[PDB]
């Protein structure tokens, strides 16, 4: 479980090693995903020094008949199979209606190339969820060694209500306003032929592996303790359900998950998600990622 540095992305490096996906939102959110040039001009992406900011427009009041709220979805140019990805995240988007994610997939053959969601949630609702979405014949055992709590254990999007097989992180500060109040933290995901693991370490953790915290060129996941989420191959050939995946980091609003009235209102968010997103630009001033680095090891 020893790996060596493959990519080191800090600040302006993201502008040449990722693209912006100016696409209709696959999750049907109240979002307008802008291109890279537009993002940089409007300061929705800011990539300089040791900082990457990816943010929502927090100034425009939207025409209800016009496009959704400007935001960004960035995708690594490179693809990865067996690897470790480490995200040093100072801030993640918050606010009613927000649906941020840091994840990997192969968009071109989804879901057959797999999807792993590393950071994901909606409407400020902690804790973080870590989830696989696959094609047929991929499930997880009811009990396996991890610190998080399994929810759905069938990863097949065709037969699991499109939920994937998920794990909830054990602490509130894994996600949302709680995470942001704490200065964020580190997410690491190891993928091999035999498993996927995710670890979360809060910013203030006394037990964060130096491997993760300082980003040296050599790491050893054997020394990282029990993962937060564990997806073993007991009932899923992991390698046959995943192919070469890009890393994606995005922020959408409302849409198929966050926008459901019961879910949005259940989070303490008033009224209509789309109406809220249209008419409360200032409420998205804290709907930003602040990323110190993303590093991949192979
Ligand atoms: C487009 O959008 C961008 C992004 O939002 C806008 O940029 C912001 O612009 C505003 C206004 O100009 C800036 O506000 C100013 O900030 C000044 C201070 O900046 C310096 O410190 C910042 C905080 O750094 C600490 O915290 C971070 C973690 O969050 C640590 O990494 C860092 O080490 C610092 O830690 C110290 O403090 C903490 C406690 O707070 C301790 O625990 C630690 O031990 C340390 O003691 C920091 O964010 C700034 O970094 C920026 O600049 C440096 C180069 O100078 C660069 O390397 C970084 O990558 C980053 O770009 C900086 O070090 C302050 O003096 C002033 O009053 C005002 O508040 C704001 O900093 C900008 N944010 C950025 C750049 O991320 C931009 O304006 C907009 N463009 C437009 C309008 O055209």
Question: Would you report the number of β strands?
Answer: 21
Distance between the termini: 10 Å
Q: What would you call the shape?
A: globular
Describe the oligomeric state of these chains in a short phrase.
monomer
Total number of distinct structural domains: 1
Beta-sheet strand percentage?
35-45%
Q: How do the SSEs run, as a string of H and E?
A: EHEEHEEEEEEEEEEEHEEHEEEHEHHHE
CATH topology: Jelly Rolls
Characterise the protein shown here.
The protein has a single domain (1-298), classed as Jelly Rolls (Sandwich), CATH 2.60.120. The chain has eight helices and 21 strands. The protein has 298 residues and is mainly beta. The strands form four sheets. Strands 1, 4, 5, 8, 15, 16, 17, 18 and 21 form a nine-stranded antiparallel β-sheet that branches. Strands 2-7-20-9-10-11-14-13 form an eight-stranded antiparallel β-sheet. It has helices at residues 14-17, 36-41, 176-181, 210-214, 238-241, 255-258, 261-266, 273-279; strands at residues 2-9, 18-20, 31-33, 45-48, 51-55, 69-71, 73-76, 83-91, 98-105, 115-120, 129-133, 138-139, 149-150, 165-168, 185-191, 195-202, 218-220, 229-232, 235-236, 246-253, 288-297. A molecule of 7 linked components (NAG-NAG-BMA-MAN-MAN-MAN-MAN) binds at residues 11, 43, 46, 48-51, 53, 90. Keywords: Glycosidase, Hydrolase, Signal. Residues 1-266 form the GH16 domain.
């Amino acid at each position: 479980a020893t790996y060596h540095l493959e990519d080191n992305w800090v600040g302006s490096a993201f502008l040449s090693t990722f693209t912006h996906e100016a696409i209709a939102d696959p999750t049907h959110g109240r979002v307008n995903y802008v291109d890279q040039a537009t993002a940089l001009a409007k300061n929705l992406t800011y990539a300089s020094g040791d900082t990457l900011i990816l943010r929502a427009d927090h100034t425009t009041t939207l025409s209800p008949s016009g496009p959704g709220r400007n935001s960004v979805r960035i995708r690594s140019i490179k693809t990865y199979t067996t690897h470790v990805a480490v995200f040093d995240v100072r801030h993640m988007p918050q606010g009613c209606g927000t649906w941020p994610a840091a994840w990997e997939t192969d968009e071109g053959d989804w879901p057959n190339g797999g999807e792993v969601d590393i950071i994901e949630g909606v409407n400020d609702q902690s804790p973080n969820a870590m989830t696989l979405h696959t094609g047929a014949n991929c499930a997880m055992p009811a009990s396996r060694t991890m610190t998080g709590h399994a929810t759905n254990n069938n990863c097949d999007v065709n037969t699991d209500g499109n939920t994937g097989c998920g794990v909830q992180a054990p602490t509130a500060n894994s996600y949302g306003p709680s995470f942001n109040a704490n200065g964020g933290g580190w997410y690491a995901m190891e993928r091999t032929n035999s498993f996927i693991k995710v670890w979360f370490f809060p910013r203030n953790a006394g037990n964060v592996p130096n491997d993760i915290a300082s980003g040296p060129a050599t790491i050893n996941t054997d020394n990282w303790g029990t993962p937060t989420a564990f997806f073993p191959n007991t009932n899923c050939d992991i390698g046959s359900h995943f192919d070469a995946n890009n890393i994606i980091i995005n922020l959408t609003f409302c849409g198929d998950w966050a926008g459901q009235a019961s879910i949005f209102n259940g989070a303490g968010c008033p009224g209509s998600c789309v109406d809220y997103v249209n008419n409360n630009p200032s409420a998205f001033a804290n709907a930003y990622w602040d990323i110190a680095s993303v590093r991949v090891y192979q």
